[PDB]
Amino acid sequence: EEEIREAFRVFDKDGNGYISAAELRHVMTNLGEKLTDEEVDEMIREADIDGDGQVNYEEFVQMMTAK
Ligand SMILES: [Ca+2]
Ligand SMILES: [Ca+2]
Structure with missing residues (x-):
């Protein structure tokens, strides 16, 4: 969804693909x-x-989604 993904797009302000703790x-x-x-x-x-x-983004999923 945009909520998770698109806000994630804003989250990665630079769109570098990678998330830093600071960005968390x-x-x-x-x-x-x-x-x-x-x-x-x-x-x-x-x-x-x-x-x-x-x-990373994958992990962004793995954190919230988890298993
Ligand atoms: Ca980033
Ligand atoms: Ca990682």
Whole structure:
């Protein structure tokens, strides 16, 4: 849907394909709830399921969607 994807398009402001923790916090800002840098690091954790040291779009799905 646009909600998830298109807002994700705004989320990736640069459209680089890759999400940083800092951008997680952006999405968090969009979400209303803004967590601090500390938590943003936890965003790497919760968002980084593949374990590459980065947050990607696939993982953006894997974080919310999960399994
Ligand atoms: Ca980005
Ligand atoms: Ca990753």
